[PDB]
Coordinates of C-alpha atoms and ligand atoms in Angstrom, one line a residue:
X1 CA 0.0 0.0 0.0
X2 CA 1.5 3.6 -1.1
X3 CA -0.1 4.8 1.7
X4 CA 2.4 2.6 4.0
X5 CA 5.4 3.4 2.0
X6 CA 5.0 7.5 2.4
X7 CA 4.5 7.0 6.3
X8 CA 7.8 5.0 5.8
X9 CA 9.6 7.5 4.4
X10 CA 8.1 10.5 6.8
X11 CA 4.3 11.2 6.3
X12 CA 3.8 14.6 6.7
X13 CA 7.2 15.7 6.9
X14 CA 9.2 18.9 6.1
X15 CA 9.1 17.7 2.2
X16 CA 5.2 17.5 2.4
X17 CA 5.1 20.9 3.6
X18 CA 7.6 22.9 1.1
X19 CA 6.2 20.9 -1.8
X20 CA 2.3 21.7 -0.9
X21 CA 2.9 25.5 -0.3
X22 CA 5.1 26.1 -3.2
X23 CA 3.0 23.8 -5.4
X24 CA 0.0 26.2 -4.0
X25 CA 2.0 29.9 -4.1
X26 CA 0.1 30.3 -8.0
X27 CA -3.2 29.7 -6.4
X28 CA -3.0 33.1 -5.1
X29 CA -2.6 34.7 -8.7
X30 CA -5.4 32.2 -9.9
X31 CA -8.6 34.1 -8.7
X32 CA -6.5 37.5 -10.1
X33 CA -6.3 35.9 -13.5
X34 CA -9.6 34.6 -13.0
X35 CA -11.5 38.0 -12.7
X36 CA -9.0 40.5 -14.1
X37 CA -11.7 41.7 -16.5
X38 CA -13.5 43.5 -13.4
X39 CA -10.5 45.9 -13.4
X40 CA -9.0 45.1 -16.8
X41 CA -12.3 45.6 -18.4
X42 CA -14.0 48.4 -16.0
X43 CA -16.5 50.4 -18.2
X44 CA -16.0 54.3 -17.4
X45 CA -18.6 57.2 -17.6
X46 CA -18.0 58.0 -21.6
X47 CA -20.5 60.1 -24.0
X48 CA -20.0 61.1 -27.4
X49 CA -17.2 63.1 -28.9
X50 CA -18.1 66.8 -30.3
X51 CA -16.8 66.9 -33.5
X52 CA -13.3 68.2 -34.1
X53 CA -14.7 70.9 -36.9
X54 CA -17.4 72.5 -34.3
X55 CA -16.1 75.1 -31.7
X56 CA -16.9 74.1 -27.8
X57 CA -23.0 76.6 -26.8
X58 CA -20.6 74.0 -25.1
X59 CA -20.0 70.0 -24.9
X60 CA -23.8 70.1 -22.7
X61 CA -25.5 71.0 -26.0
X62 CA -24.1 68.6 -28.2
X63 CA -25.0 65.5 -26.0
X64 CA -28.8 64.5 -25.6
X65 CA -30.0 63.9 -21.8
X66 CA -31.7 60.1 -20.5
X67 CA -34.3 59.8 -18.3
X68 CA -31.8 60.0 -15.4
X69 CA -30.4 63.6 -16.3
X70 CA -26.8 62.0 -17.8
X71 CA -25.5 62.4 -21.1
X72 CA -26.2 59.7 -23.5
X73 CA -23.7 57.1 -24.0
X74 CA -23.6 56.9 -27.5
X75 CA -25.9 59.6 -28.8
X76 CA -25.0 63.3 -30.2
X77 CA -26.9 65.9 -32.0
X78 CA -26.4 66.4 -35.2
X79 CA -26.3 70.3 -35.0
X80 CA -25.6 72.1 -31.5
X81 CA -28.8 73.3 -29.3
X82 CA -33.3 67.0 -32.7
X83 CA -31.3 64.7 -34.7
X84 CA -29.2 62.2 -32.5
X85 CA -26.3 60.0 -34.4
X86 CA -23.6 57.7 -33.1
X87 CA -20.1 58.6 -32.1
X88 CA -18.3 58.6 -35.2
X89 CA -15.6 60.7 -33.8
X90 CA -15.1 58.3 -30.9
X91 CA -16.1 59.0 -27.0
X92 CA -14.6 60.1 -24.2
X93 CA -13.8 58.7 -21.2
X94 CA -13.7 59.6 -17.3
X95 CA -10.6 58.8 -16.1
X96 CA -10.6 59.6 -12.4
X97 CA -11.0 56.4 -11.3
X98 CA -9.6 54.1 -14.3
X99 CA -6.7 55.8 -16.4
X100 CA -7.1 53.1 -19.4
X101 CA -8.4 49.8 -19.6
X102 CA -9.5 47.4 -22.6
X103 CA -12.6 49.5 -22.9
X104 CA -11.3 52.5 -22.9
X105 CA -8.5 51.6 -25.4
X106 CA -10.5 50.0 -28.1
X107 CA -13.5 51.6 -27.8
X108 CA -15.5 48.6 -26.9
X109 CA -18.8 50.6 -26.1
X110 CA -22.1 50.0 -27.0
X111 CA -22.6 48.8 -30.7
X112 CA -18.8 46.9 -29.1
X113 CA -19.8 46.7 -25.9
X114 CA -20.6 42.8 -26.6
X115 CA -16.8 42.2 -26.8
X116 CA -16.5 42.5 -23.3
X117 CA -18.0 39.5 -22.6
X118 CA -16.4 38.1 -25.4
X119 CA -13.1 38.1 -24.1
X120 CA -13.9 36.7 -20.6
X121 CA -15.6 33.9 -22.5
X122 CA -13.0 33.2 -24.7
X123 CA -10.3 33.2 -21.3
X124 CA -12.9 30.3 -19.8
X125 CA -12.9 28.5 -23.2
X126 CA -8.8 28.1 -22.2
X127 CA -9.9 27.1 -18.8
X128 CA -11.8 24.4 -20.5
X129 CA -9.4 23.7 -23.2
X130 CA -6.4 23.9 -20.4
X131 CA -8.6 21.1 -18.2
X132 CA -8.8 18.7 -21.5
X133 CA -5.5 19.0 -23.3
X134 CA -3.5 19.3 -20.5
X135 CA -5.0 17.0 -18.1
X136 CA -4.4 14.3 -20.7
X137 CA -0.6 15.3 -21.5
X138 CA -0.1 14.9 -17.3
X139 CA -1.0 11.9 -17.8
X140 CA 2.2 11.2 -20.3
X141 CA 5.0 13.8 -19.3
X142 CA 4.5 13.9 -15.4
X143 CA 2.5 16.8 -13.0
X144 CA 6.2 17.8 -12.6
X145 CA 7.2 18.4 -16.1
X146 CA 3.8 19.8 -17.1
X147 CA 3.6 22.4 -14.2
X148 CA 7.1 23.8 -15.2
X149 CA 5.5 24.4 -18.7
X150 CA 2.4 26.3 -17.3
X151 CA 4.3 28.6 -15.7
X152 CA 6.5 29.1 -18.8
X153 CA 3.2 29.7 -20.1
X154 CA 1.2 31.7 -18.1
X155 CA 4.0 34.5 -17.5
X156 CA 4.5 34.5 -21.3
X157 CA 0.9 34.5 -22.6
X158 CA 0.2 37.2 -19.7
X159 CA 3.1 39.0 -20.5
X160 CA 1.9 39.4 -24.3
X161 CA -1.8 39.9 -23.6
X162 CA -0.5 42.8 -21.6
X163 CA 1.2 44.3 -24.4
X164 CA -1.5 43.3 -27.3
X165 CA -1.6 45.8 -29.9
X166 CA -5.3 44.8 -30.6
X167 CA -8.1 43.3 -29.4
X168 CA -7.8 39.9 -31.4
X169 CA -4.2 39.2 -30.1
X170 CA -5.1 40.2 -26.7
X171 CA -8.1 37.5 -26.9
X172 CA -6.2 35.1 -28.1
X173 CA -3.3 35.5 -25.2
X174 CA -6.0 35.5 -22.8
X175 CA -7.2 32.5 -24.1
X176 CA -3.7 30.4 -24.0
X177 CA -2.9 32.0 -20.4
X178 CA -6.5 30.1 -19.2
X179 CA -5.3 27.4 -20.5
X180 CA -1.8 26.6 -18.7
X181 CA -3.5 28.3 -15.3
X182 CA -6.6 25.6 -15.4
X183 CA -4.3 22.9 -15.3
X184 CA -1.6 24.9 -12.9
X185 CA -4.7 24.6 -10.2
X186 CA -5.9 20.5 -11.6
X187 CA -1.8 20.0 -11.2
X188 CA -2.1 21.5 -7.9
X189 CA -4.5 19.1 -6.1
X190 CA -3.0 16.1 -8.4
X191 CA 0.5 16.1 -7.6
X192 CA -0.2 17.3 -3.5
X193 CA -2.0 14.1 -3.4
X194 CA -0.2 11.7 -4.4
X195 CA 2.4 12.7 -1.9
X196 CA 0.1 13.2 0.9
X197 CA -1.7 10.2 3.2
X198 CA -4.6 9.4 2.2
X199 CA -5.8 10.5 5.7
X200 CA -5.1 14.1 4.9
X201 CA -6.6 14.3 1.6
X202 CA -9.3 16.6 3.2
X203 CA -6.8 18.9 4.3
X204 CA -5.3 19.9 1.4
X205 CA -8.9 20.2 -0.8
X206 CA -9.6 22.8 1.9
X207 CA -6.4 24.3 1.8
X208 CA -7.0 25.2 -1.8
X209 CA -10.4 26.1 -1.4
X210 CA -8.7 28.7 1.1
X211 CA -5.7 30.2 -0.9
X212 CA -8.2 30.9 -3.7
X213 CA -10.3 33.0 -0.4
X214 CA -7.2 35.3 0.0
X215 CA -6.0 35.5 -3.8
X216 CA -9.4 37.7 -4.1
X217 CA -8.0 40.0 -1.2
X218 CA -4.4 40.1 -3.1
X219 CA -6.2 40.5 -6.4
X220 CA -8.3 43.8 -4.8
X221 CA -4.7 45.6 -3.6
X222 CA -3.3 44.8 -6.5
X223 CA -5.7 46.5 -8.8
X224 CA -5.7 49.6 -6.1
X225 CA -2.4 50.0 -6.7
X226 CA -1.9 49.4 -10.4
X227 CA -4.7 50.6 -11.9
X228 CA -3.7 51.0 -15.6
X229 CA -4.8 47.7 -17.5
X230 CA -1.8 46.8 -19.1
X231 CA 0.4 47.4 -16.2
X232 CA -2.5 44.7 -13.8
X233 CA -2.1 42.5 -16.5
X234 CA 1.9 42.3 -16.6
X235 CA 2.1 42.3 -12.7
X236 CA -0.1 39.6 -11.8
X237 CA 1.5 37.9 -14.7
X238 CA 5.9 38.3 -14.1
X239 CA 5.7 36.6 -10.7
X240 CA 5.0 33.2 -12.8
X241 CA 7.8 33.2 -13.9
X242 CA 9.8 32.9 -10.5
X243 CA 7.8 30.4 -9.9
X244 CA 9.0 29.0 -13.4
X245 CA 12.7 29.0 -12.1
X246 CA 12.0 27.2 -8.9
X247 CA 10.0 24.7 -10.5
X248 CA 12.8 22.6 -11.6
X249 CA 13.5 21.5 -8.1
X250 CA 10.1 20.0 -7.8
X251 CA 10.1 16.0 -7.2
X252 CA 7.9 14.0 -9.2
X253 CA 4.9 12.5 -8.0
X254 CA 6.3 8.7 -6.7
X255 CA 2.6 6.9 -7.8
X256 CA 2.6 8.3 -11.0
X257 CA 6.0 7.4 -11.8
X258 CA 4.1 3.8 -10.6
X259 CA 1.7 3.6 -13.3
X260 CA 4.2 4.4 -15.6
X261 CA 5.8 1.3 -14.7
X262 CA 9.5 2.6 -13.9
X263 CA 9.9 1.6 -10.5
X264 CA 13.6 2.7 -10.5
X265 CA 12.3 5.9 -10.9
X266 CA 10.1 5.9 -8.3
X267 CA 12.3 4.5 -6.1
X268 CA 14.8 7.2 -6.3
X269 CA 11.9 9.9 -5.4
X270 CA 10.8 8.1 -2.1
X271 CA 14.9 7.8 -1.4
X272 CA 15.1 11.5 -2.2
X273 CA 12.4 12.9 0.5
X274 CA 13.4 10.0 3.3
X275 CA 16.8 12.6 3.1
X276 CA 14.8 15.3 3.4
X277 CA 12.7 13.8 5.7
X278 CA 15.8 13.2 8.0
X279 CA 14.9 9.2 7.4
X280 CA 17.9 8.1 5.3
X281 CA 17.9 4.9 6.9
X282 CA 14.0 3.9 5.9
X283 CA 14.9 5.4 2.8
X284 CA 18.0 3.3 2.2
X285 CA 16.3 0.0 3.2
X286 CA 14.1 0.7 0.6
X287 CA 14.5 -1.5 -2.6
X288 CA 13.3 -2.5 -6.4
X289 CA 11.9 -5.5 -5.0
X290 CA 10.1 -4.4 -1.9
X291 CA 8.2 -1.8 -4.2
X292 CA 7.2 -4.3 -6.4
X293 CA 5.7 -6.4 -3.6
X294 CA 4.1 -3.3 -1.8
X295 CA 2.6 -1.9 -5.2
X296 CA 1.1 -5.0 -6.8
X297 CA -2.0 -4.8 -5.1
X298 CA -2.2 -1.1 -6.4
X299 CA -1.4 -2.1 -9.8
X300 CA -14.6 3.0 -15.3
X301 CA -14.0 4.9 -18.7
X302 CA -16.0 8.3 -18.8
X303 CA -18.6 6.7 -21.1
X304 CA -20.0 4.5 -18.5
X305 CA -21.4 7.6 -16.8
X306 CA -23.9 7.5 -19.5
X307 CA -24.1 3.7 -20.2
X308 CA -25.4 2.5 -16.9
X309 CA -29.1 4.0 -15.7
X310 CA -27.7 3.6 -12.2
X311 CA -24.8 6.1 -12.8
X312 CA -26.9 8.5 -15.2
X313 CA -29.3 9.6 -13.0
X314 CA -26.1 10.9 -10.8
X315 CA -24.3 12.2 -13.7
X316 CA -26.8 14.2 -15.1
X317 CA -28.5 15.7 -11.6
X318 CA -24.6 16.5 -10.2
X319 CA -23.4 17.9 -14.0
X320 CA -26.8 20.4 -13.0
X321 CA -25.1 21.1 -10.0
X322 CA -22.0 22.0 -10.9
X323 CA -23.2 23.7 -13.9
X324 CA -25.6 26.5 -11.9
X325 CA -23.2 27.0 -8.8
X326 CA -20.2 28.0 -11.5
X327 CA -22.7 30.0 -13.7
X328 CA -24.3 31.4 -11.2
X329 CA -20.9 32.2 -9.5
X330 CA -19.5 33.9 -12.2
X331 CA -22.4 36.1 -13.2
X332 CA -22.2 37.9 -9.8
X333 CA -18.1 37.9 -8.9
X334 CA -17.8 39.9 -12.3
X335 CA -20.6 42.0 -12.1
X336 CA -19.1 44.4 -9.4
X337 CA -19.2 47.5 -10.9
X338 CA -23.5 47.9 -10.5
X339 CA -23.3 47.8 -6.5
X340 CA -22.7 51.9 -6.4
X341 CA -20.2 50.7 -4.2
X342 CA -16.2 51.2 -5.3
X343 CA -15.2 47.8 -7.0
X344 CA -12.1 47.3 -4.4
X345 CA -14.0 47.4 -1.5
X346 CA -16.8 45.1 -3.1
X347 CA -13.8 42.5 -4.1
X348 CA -12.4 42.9 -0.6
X349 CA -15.8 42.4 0.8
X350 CA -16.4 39.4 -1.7
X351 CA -13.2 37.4 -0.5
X352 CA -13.8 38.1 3.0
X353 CA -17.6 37.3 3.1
X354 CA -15.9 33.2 1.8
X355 CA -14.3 32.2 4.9
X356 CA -17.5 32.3 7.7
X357 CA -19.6 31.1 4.5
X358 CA -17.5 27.7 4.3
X359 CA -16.9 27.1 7.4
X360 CA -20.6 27.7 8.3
X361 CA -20.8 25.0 5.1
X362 CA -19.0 22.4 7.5
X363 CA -20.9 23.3 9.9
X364 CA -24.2 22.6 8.1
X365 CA -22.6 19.5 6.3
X366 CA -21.9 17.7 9.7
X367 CA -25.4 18.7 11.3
X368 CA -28.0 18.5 8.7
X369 CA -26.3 16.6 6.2
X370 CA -25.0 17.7 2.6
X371 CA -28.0 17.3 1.0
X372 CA -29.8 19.8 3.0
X373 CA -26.5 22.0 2.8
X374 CA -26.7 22.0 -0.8
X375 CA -30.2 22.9 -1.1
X376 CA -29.8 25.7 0.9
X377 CA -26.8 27.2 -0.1
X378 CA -28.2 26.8 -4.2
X379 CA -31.8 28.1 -2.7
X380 CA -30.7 31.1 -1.1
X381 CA -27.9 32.2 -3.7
X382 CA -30.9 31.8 -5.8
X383 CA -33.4 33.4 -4.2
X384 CA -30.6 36.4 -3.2
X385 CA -30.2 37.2 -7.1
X386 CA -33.7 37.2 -7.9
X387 CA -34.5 39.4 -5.6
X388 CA -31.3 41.6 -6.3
X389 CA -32.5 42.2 -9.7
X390 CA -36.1 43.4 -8.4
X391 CA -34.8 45.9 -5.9
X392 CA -33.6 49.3 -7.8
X393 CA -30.2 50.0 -8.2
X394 CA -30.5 52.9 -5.8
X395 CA -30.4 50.4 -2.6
X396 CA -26.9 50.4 -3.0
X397 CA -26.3 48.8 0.7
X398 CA -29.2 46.5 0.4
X399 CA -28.2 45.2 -3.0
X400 CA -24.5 45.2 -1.4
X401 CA -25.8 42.8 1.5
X402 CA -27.6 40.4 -1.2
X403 CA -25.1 40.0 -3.7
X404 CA -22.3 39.4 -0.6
X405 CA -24.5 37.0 0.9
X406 CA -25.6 35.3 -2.6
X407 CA -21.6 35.0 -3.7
X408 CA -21.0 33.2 0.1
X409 CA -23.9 31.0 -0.8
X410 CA -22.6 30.2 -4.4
X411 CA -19.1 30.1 -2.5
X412 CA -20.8 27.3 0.1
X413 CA -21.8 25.3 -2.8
X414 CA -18.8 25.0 -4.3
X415 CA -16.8 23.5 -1.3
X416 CA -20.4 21.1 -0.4
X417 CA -20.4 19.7 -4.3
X418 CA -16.9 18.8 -4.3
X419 CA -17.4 16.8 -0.8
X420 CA -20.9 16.0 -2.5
X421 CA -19.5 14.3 -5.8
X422 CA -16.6 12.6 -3.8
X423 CA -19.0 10.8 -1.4
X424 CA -21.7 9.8 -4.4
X425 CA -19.6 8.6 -7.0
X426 CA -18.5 4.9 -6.2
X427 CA -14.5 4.4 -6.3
X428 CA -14.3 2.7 -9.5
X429 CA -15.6 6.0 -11.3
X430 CA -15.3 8.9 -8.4
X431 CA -12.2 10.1 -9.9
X432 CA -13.8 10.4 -13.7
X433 CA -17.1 12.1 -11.8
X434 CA -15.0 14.6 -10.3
X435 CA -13.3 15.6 -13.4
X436 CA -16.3 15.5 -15.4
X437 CA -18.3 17.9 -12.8
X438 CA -15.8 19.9 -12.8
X439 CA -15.6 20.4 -16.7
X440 CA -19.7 21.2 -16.3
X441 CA -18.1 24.2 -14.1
X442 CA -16.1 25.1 -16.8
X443 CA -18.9 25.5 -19.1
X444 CA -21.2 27.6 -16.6
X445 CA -18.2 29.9 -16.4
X446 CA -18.2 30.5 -20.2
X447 CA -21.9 30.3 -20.9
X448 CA -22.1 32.8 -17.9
X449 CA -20.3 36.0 -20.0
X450 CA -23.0 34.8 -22.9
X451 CA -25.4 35.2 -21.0
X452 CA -24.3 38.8 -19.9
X453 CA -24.4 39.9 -23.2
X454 CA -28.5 39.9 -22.7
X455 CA -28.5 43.2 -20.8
X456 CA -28.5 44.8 -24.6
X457 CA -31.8 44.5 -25.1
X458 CA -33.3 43.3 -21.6
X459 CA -30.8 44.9 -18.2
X460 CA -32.5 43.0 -15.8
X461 CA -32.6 39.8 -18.1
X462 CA -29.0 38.2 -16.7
X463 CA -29.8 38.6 -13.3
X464 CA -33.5 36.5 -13.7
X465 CA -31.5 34.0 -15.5
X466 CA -28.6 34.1 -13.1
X467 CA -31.1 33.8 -10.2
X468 CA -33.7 31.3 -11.8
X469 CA -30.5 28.7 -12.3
X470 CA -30.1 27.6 -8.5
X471 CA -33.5 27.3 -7.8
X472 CA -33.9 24.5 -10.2
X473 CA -30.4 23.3 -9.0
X474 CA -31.8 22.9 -5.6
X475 CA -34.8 21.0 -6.6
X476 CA -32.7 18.4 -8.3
X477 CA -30.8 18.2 -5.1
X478 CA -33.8 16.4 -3.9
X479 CA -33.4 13.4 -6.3
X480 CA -29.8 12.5 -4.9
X481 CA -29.2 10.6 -1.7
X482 CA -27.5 12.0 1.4
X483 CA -24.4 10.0 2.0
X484 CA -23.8 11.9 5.9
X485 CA -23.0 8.7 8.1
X486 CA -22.6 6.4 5.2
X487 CA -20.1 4.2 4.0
X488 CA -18.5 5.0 0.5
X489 CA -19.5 2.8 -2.1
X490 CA -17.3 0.6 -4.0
X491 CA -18.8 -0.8 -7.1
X492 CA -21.8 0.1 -9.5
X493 CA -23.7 -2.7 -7.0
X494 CA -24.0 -0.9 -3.9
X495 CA -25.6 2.3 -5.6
X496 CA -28.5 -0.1 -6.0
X497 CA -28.6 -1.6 -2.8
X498 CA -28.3 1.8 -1.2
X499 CA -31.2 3.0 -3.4
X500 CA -33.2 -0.7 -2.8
Ligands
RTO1 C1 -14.1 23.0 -10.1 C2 -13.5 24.4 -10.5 C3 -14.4 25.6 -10.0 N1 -14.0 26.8 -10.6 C4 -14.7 27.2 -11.9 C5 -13.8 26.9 -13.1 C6 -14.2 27.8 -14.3 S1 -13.0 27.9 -9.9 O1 -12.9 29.2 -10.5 O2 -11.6 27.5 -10.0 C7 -13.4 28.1 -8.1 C8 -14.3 29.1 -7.7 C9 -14.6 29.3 -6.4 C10 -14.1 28.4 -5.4 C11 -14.5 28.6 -4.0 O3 -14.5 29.7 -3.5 O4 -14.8 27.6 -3.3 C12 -13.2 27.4 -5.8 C13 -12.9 27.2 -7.1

């Protein structure tokens, strides 16, 4: 058992510890790089140009008033004070608060305005391509070998994005950087497992869970004090590559090298940390032969999720699950900017609001159960956006207090489905489940943008559809069985005899 051989060479030891937090250091850049565009992308106050040939009646009688007595975003008069046309001489923007960002730069503004989204969609299509492509090449170069290439990666494609000369090159940089930083957190959790105890599996899970909770406070300070765009997008992107150049002194995870089926290679890595570990003699009674003998014992596809009825009924109600808590997440976390609130102390609010919310998840999880913890943590985020988008924007600290208390909710959910899916699936296919809900994640977070885009034509359209999400999410919580006080099935034969 492998579990035996890594108490053998130390356990939790002083290699356990400088592996897991250098492996986890990018985590605190992830949730920066995951909603950059809030600051990146912040829309200023902007009305239409005057044109250059026209004398400044003044700029007030060449822009047409709204309802609420500001100038029209993209509306001028034809002739100075009623003929209203677009800004063909461009718009201009406030800058007291945000001295350039992508909007500003290329104009992406009404008639444009859609681009936005685009760009934060086309990031999480990296995320999802970065889950795929590179959770298979993992598999065939080593966590080790991969992560040093993400890192290569992430500072280079964050680097260029930051100096795009357009919009397409800085779309398609922001694309390849989701894709080395969505495996640079799936390599994160891999390779700390495989050289934890299985009896402290639980730790690190919540130990991610947590350095994404205070990369949202690092991401708010950051953005204070770098305001300019392409400046936020360089910083939070050069540190990757220090942790590029201490990469190479990462050690290999010893159970994939296993699988591989080079056990002189594995054997060397377990020799490696006993010295670290300050048990060189452990480490030196180690041999070929005694892996071989400990291992042996050790030594479903994805399609069986929808081949057996059993399994399908859990793939499809979870894949709901995992969907609406990520789209749901991510149409609120990067909607900040409509609080009437400034966005940094909404982001510091927003990271601070996740640490009572999971741990009143454990809470909940241990007492009621995590069936009732998921229902109420989908129902309320739920019911919290619905009712945000009825209330007028004007109850700025009302809407404040909904939104903060919806994004703990969504931010509950997400730590109760990942216990959820670990305890449903059975062992043979909990691994593939907890891949595959994740990728449903991924594709609530790029829908999520899309569905953004709505506010053209309908403002308070996203938030009803952000809102309406959870609530069926919570009903199909109903169908699946709490597991609290039950043992973890093995095979595809005890989900029936559970369920008989
Ligand atoms: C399974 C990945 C979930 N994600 C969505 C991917 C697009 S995530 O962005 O990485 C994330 C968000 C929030 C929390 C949390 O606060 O518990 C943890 C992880």
């Amino acid at each position: 058992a492998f579990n035996d051989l890594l108490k053998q060479v130390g356990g939790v030891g002083r290699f356990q510890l400088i592996q897991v937090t250098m492996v986890v250091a990018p985590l605190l850049l992830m949730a920066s790089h995951n909603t950059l565009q809030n600051f990146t992308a912040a829309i200023p106050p902007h009305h239409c140009r005057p044109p250059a040939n026209a004398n400044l009646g003044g700029l007030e009688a060449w822009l047409p008033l709204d309802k609420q007595g500001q100038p029209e975003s993209c509306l001028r008069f034809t002739s100075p004070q009623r003929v209203t046309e677009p800004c063909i001489d461009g718009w201009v923007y406030d800058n007291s608060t945000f001295p350039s960002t992508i909007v500003t730069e290329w104009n992406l503004v009404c008639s444009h305005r859609a681009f936005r989204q685009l760009a934060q969609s086309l990031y999480m299509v990296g995320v999802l391509l970065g889950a795929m492509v590179f959770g298979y090449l993992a598999d065939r170069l080593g966590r080790r070998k991969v992560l040093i290439l993400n890192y290569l990666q992430t500072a280079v494609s964050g680097t260029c994005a930051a100096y795009a000369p357009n919009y397409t090159v800085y779309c398609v940089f922001r694309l390849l950087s989701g894709m080395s930083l969505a495996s640079i957190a799936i390599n994160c959790m891999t390779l700390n497992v495989e050289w934890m105890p299985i009896h402290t599996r639980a730790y690190v899970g919540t130990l991610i869970g947590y350095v994404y909770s205070l990369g949202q406070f690092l991401l708010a300070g950051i953005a204070y004090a770098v305001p300019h765009w392409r400046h936020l997008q360089l910083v939070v992107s050069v540190p990757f590559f220090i942790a590029f150049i201490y990469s190479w002194f990462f050690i290999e995870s010893a159970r994939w090298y296993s699988s591989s089926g080079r056990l002189d290679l594995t054997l060397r890595a377990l020799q490696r940390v006993a010295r670290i570990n300050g048990k060189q003699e452990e480490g030196a009674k180690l041999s070929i032969e005694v892996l071989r003998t400990s291992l042996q014992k050790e030594l479903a596809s994805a399609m069986e999720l929808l081949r057996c009825p059993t399994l399908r009924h859990l793939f499809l109600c979870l894949s709901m699950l995992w969907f609406a808590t990520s789209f749901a997440y991510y149409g609120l976390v990067m909607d900040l900017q409509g609080f009437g609130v400034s966005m940094y102390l909404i982001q510091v609010i927003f990271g601070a609001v996740d640490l009572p919310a999971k741990f009143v998840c454990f809470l909940v999880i241990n007492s009621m159960g995590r069936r009732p913890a998921q229902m109420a943590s989908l129902l309320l985020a739920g019911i919290c956006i619905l009712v945000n988008g009825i209330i007028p924007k004007s109850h700025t600290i009302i809407r404040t207090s909904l939104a903060v208390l919806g994004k703990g909710c969504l931010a509950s959910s997400f730590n109760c489905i990942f216990l959820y899916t670990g305890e449903l699936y059975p062992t043979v296919i909990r691994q593939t489940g907890l891949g595959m809900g994740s990728t449903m994640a991924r594709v609530g977070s790029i829908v999520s943008p899309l569905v953004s885009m709505t506010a053209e034509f309908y403002p308070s359209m996203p938030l009803f559809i952000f809102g309406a999400v959870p609530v069926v999410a919570s009903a199909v919580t109903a169908l699946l069985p709490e597991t609290l006080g039950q043992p973890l099935p093995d095979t595809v034969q005890d989900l029936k005899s559970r369920s008989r």
